[PDB]
Design a protein around this ligand. Structure first.
Ligand SMILES: [Zn+2]
Ligand SMILES: [Zn+2]
Ligand SMILES: [Zn+2]
Ligand SMILES: [Zn+2]
Lengths: 331, 263, 405, 109, 191
């Protein structure tokens, strides 16, 4: 797509902790497989979108539990998921209070964040404290986007939830299909005609080591069991002390970003194109791969759009998944 | 099983100015230090693999992909084909004027997909730690920064380390790459001594970076400028449509012609 | 004494969170600000007990049925919502003439503990009251949503006619048994439990036709494939190509040098296959090694990191108290500070922030004097940098707003 | 989809059927070639009422010289209303294709 | 028989487990109580909580009703439409069909039972693009004459492996059915 995307993205993951998480349709029980692919999900999402954040709610025993708050580093989330392997999964799940707390925070937030909730939802019987239909009308009117990945069944309710919060509903066959769905929700989803297009004020703090062998330095502890920090990253708005640069300013409200962070997600904006895939021999006067200078010992030849060079299957998967650019069009 | 992928920045203009300088250190000792590093890497273990790429100004042609000398034949034949290939490459060449600064993004792209296919070649018993040495001697063009970051992030994902020996001038993008991927950066202070840095700071593999005490990491500058006046920024204005850095606040966003909503 | 309430609040806090109580003392008790301000602008708590309660899903009489073997559990709260007749009965019984001692003493009677006869355990009379609520909705009480939906004509079509019909035998005034009557009664109770559950969770041409309508609607073609896409066609992408790296000194000289260098390097690479260029290379090997070694070149006298670990632990506790306190101070300061918010209430809050700032600097100087005069080490001047930048933004805002007068 | 049902063009209402609809034509090809009652069995997949009306209108259009009035007979009152409104959809399709003059007194009772 | 079955699903400890999985709506022969049980059965599906309507294969519950795209996924035909209150109108119509028409006793009983059973289970594919489980629960539907009088568009999809399944084999066939038939079956798979 050549469309607007939601690139600052407070996503918020709601997992079941239902009775139906303990069912053994997957190769381990659904809790374990779901939690493993969420570990992979947090990894690839922080690997691809650096500005954004994640928060994890386990929904358990008709109540909702904010298990890990909305933050932007994978250590705390994956540590909490390694903890949450050990849980119990008892009682029916309430999708009311958790969506209420997520709405309550995601109603007054800066209008440019595409505020997104991902409900990995398994069971069928849901207890509703208010009216479910009025909750969807409210959540339709409340600026947020909710997408539900479903297990074992499809409720016209998850379809209404997905198409109204503006999300997408999906049901799971396999391990591989479920990986494809979470990979589909890694990428920044396109924006509606409703979300604010603001201009967030940003800060770009340089790294600062101990000035000149600590000749008149500023010895601090940290800012969020810490040692004595000699130098590091400042915050020019408030001039505080941060160890890791990609941290929302804890005492100002500025967002702090290093030079790579914006460049780590530039491929979404000038994206790739399609490779013309042709299996047969077909006029190939360029026998060797323009990717890595190797012969084409298979019947799959892939030719770009602009330069129209030659690529094999290995160069296809590598260019379209990782390098994100054609090597020909750079030249 | 390891895979060193040397990349030698064969700028014919730069080494031509180096050979008209009538110094001690010309391109012959550069490519010879490359081959002695390659034979040393194949020499350290039987299972090691080697691939040597030469970024020319307009092409990324690979160099690498009885015992009369007395060396192992699989080493004598490889050295003969690398020597004859650089002599066919650099001597009989072309001349163009619009594109005369060297490239490094394409050769790194070929190295990335080569390591991908050679990791598909690997069977289930063994595994392969891979890295890319970059021997840079020219000035990198700014014009391919959009491309260049991409290959770094590919080496971020594919877990390929990146190392760099720069010869004459410092290079911000390449020390940036060696900071991101976890590799190593080194600016040589005296050129005739280039061969064994490759032998003891860039020869040792991933399970010898942690054992050897090595020259310390230089602090990496995360300088950032606008697309407007190219000057250094500590607080900038970044659009959410174009995703571009502006220095001073402006009504109409130039990078994507955005009908900017004003509050 | 402050406020019968608040006095319990700020107190409850001071007591519990040991990292926050401390702070509360270090700020209020230290004579920097007043207790009311601190507890005032520190709103961070939950909405309700669970932002709502647990609605009566179903089997509110049969979740842990009749056995625990204005507050209560899930069953008592769901009955309090679901059957308001039981709510008014709880208003009558418990307020007048009996207590939970007498009421639960009259609860361990039969049908609930003696297992007499009531067709089920302790939710049986609750199911009978739900059946009476259904019969009140059908006989005494009426509905509400009955217009085109729940049409009267559809109801008229059912039930045939009062006079004798080909198959009149439908509802028989005779034939009332024991087990058959009990089974019919159970069905009515279950149907109304769902109806009461819908009433509790509220904080025919109707259904079939309305969902048939949901399946219709041409929403897909209603607007577009992806609403109103704002196609992002970037104007000046060259600003992306050479990014935020500053302009290096890049002055390649005149294109005569291009031709000269092409000539010299085409003549240079002409030579090949020496076999031996290692007379100079052995010189290089004796030379390359020196650079690798710490002695000589390539060593910066770096990775030293001379630290001051002399009195670790109690000074670390001091700095934990100090960074928590100054974090709260600068939290309030830079939270109200950023946008000027050009009115008189926010400027008055800024003046209170100025007073708290000056007394914070006094308390920080007092804490530095009481701490660092022990063994003469451990520069605390980072906290003084933070508070000096607060001081500086305050005076710079004052001069800026006086220029904006 | 513009069916030839051996005398007449038929505009399939919405434009979606399985290949069984082509088999469906053959089944009533026998039904109206000779007049004399006839029992059909289309399962519940195809437009029950929609299927029972497209081909009979195709025959009456191809050769409508021996048919005055259709008397549909469905039992339940919602079906009466449902079959009338599907007939009304088909006349609206029929008049979208043609023009405005589509004399047709449909009538429930 | 539904009276007696749902009676002995209570004294025997079964029906609370069926409650734990889905919400029952048992039938009665009131004209208004059936309509309320149907309305709550269709509201429960909209709530998303599992529902389950169990009725009699003779009455008005299955006459007017047409299978919903998502209102009935699994039509469970309990028993073979067999009665136990026949006076002599049945015996006399059967004596007539022996005598003056030529149709057997055991032929007409099987015909009548199968037209009622496949009537209450035969409107499932309201729209070609619908998935519908339709189980027959007793052994008599496998006995050749009774299976031979179901229509052709149901015998075509009645596999010999599916013939006389267990409960749990049928449950696993239902799971594999629903999983293979909940995927995107778009219009491009039909042209
Ligand atoms: Zn700040
Ligand atoms: Zn291309
Ligand atoms: Zn290739
Ligand atoms: Zn822009």
């Amino acid at each position: 797509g050549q469309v607007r995307l939601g690139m600052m993205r407070h996503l918020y993951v709601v997992v079941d902790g239902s009775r139906t998480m303990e069912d053994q349709d997957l190769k381990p029980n659904r809790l374990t497989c779901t939690l493993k692919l969420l570990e992979y999900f947090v990894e690839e999402y922080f690997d691809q979108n650096p500005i954004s954040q994640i928060g994890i709610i386990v929904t358990k025993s008709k109540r909702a539990e904010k298990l890990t708050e909305l933050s932007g580093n994978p250590r705390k989330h994956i540590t909490s998921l390694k903890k949450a392997v050990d849980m119990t999964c008892h009682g029916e799940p309430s999708l009311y209070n958790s969506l209420s707390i997520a709405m309550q925070t995601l109603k007054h937030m800066p209008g440019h964040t595409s505020r997104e909730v991902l409900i990995i939802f398994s069971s069928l019987t849901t207890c509703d404290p208010s009216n479910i239909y009025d909750l969807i009308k409210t959540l339709k009117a409340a600026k947020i986007r909710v997408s539900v990945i479903g297990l074992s069944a499809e409720v016209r309710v998850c379809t209404v939830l997905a198409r109204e919060t503006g999300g997408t509903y999906h049901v799971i066959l396999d391990e591989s299909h479920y990986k494809e769905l979470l990979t589909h929700h890694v990428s920044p989803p396109p924006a509606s005609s409703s979300s604010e297009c603001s201009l967030i004020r940003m800060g770009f703090p340089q790294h600062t080591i101990a000035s000149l062998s600590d000749q008149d330095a500023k010895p601090s502890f940290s800012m969020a069991e810490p040692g004595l920090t000699l130098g590091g990253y400042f915050c020019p708005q408030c001039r505080a002390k941060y160890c890791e640069l990609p941290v929302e300013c804890k005492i100002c409200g500025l967002t702090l970003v290093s030079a790579p962070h914006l460049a780590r997600s530039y491929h979404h904006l000038f994206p790739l194109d399609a490779f013309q895939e042709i299996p047969l021999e077909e006029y190939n006067g360029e026998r060797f791969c323009y990717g890595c200078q190797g012969e084409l010992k298979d019947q799959h030849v892939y030719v770009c759009a602009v330069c129209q060079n030659v690529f094999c299957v290995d160069c296809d998967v590598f260019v379209h998944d990782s390098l994100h650019c054609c090597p020909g069009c750079i030249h | 099983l390891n895979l060193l992928v040397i990349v030698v920045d064969a700028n014919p203009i730069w080494w031509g100015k180096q050979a008209l300088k009538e110094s001690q250190f010309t391109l012959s000792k550069c490519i010879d230090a490359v081959m002695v590093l390659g034979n040393s890497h194949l020499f350290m273990n039987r299972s090691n693999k080697l691939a040597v790429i030469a970024s020319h100004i307009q092409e990324s042609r690979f160099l690498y992909p009885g015992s009369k000398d007395g060396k192992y034949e699989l080493l004598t034949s490889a050295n003969e084909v690398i020597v004859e290939e650089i002599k066919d490459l650099m001597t009989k060449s072309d001349i163009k004027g619009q594109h005369t600064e060297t490239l490094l993004a394409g050769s790194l792209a070929k190295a990335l997909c080569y390591i991908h296919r050679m990791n598909k070649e690997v069977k289930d018993n063994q595994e392969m730690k891979s890295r890319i040495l970059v021997i840079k001697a020219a000035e990198d063009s700014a014009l391919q920064y959009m491309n260049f970051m991409n290959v770094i992030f590919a080496a971020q994902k594919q877990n390929i380390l990146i190392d760099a020996c720069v010869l004459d001038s410092d290079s911000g993008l390449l020390q940036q790459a060696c900071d991101i991927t976890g590799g190593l950066y080194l600016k040589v202070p005296q050129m005739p001594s280039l061969l064994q840095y490759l032998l003891w700071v860039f020869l040792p593999d991933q399970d010898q970076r942690s054992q050897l005490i090595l020259p310390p990491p230089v602090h990496v500058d995360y300088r950032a400028a606008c697309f407007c006046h190219r000057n250094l920024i500590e607080i900038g204005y970044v659009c959410s449509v174009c995703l571009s850095i502006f220095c001073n606040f402006s009504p109409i966003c130039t990078t994507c012609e955005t009908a900017f909503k004003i509050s | 004494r402050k406020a019968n309430k608040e006095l319990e609040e700020k107190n409850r806090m001071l007591q519990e969170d040991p990292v926050l109580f401390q702070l509360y003392k270090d700020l209020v008790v230290s004579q920097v600000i007043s207790a009311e301000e601190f507890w005032a602008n520190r709103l961070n708590v939950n909405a309700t007990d669970s932002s709502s309660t647990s609605n009566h899903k179903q089997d509110v009489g049969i979740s842990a049925a009749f056995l625990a073997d204005n507050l209560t559990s899930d069953i008592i709260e769901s009955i309090f919502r679901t059957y308001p007749a039981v709510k008014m009965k709880y208003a009558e019984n418990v307020p007048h003439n009996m207590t939970e001692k007498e009421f639960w003493t009259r609860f361990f009677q039969s049908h609930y503990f003696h297992r007499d006869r009531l067709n089920t355990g302790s939710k049986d009379l609750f199911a009978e009251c739900a059946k009476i609520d259904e019969k009140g909705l059908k006989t005494m009480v009426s509905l509400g949503v009955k217009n085109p939906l729940l049409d009267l004509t559809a109801l008229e079509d059912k039930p045939l006619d009062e006079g004798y019909g080909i198959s009149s035998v439908p509802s028989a005034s005779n034939s009332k048994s024991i087990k058959e009557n009990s089974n019919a009664a159970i069905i009515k109770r279950f149907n109304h439990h769902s109806a009461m559950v819908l009433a509790a969770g509220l904080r025919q041409p109707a259904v079939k036709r309305a969902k048939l309508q949901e399946s219709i609607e041409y929403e897909d073609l209603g607007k577009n494939n992806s609403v109103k896409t704002i196609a992002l066609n970037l104007k000046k992408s060259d600003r992306y190509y050479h990014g935020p790296t500053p302009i290096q000194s890049l002055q390649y000289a005149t294109s005569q040098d291009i031709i000269n260098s092409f000539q010299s390097i085409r003549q240079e690479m002409e030579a090949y296959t020496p076999k031996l260029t290692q007379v100079l290379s052995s010189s290089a090997a004796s030379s390359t090694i020196t650079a690798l070694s710490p002695g000589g070149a390539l060593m910066q006298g770096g990775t030293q990191q001379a630290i001051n670990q002399m009195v670790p632990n109690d000074i670390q506790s001091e700095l934990k108290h100090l960074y928590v306190a100054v974090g709260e101070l600068l939290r309030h300061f830079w939270s109200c500070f950023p946008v000027n918010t050009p009115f008189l209430e926010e400027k008055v809050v800024k003046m209170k922030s100025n007073l708290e700032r000056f007394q914070v600097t006094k308390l920080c100087p007092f804490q530095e004097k009481i701490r660092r005069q022990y063994l003469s080490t451990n520069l605390v001047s980072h906290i003084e940098e933070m508070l000096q930048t607060a001081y500086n933004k305050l005076h710079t805002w004052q001069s800026r707003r006086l220029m904006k007068k | 989809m513009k069916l030839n049902v051996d005398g007449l063009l038929v505009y399939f209402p919405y434009d979606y059927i399985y290949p069984e609809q082509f088999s469906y034509m053959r089944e009533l090809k026998r039904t109206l070639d000779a007049k004399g009652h006839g029992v059909l069995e289309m399962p519940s997949g195809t437009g029950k009422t929609v299927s029972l009306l497209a081909l009979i209108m195709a025959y009456q259009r191809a050769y409508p010289l021996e048919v005055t009035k259709l008397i549909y007979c469905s039992r339940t009152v919602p079906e009466i209303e449902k079959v009338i409104e599907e007939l009304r959809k088909l006349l609206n399709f029929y008049e979208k294709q043609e023009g405005e003059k589509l004399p047709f007194l449909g009538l429930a009772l | 028989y539904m009276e007696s079955t749902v009676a002995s699903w209570y004294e025997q400890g079964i029906l609370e487990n069926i409650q734990r999985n889905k919400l029952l709506f048992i039938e009665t022969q009131d004209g208004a109580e059936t309509s309320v049980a149907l309305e709550k059965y269709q509201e429960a599906c909209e709530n998303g909580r599992g529902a389950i309507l169990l009725s009699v294969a003779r009455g008005k519950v299955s006459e007017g009703i047409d299978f919903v795209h998502h209102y009935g996924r699994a039509v469970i035909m309990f028993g073979v439409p067999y009665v136990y209150t026949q006076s002599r109108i049945l015996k006399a119509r059967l004596e007539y069909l022996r005598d003056q028409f030529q149709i057997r006793e055991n032929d007409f009983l099987t015909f009548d039972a199968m037209r009622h059973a496949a009537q209450c289970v035969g409107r499932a594919i309201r729209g070609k693009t619908d998935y519908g489980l339709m189980v027959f629960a007793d052994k008599r539907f496998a006995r050749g004459d009774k299976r031979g009088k179901l229509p052709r568009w149901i015998q075509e999809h009645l596999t010999d492996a599916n013939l006389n399944l267990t409960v749990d084999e049928g449950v696993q066939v239902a799971k594999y059915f629903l999983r293979q038939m909940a995927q995107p079956f778009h219009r491009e798979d039909q042209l």
